Amino acid sequence: GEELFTGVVPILVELDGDVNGHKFSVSGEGEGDATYGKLTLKFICTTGKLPVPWPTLVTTLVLCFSRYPDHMKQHDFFKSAMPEGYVQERTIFFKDDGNYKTRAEVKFEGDTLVNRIELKGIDFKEDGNILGHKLEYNYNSHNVYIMADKQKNGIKSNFKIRHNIEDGSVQLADHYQQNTPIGDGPVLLPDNHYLSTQSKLSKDPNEKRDHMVLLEFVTAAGIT
Length: 224
Hints:
mainly beta, Green Fluorescent Protein, globular
């Protein structure tokens, strides 16, 4: 698995979304360079205006591009599953609002690393902070505890993302995540460890469609 990520790899993201029955689709293109834990992606809402805030989709829209240092490579579940790939499923609970359920397949199609997502959202407030677009277009750096899931030959994680509301308060997004190999393995089952993430959101001034430019760095920080 590791050999597939030694250089720069093209990325394709395809998301089909349905929140409270608002149907939408997002297409993403870019490249990842796991040597530096680095990825650059431009996302387009291909159905018009995104019905939810772009920052709420950052975690949903490829942790195989994380930099695992030498002493951590035995804990790299994400690359070990390649090229066949892994399934990444989440529930995202928005405090005092609705929740997303996502299921994604991350795998190689030829030389391209693909992330194909299905997203369903339920119980959102049509005029709340999410469907009302009241979140700031930014993102906080974050650390996540990746835990082994030996029952599923995979990994699992529980973490909190804090979105900035335009009124100066925080919109909490509780994440639960599980990952399993496509095709029943084999994979490296890791010991519990941390990934350190930072994400910069920007916009292409010449791009007239609703879009997000994302620069993301993820590093396996260590066991502790």
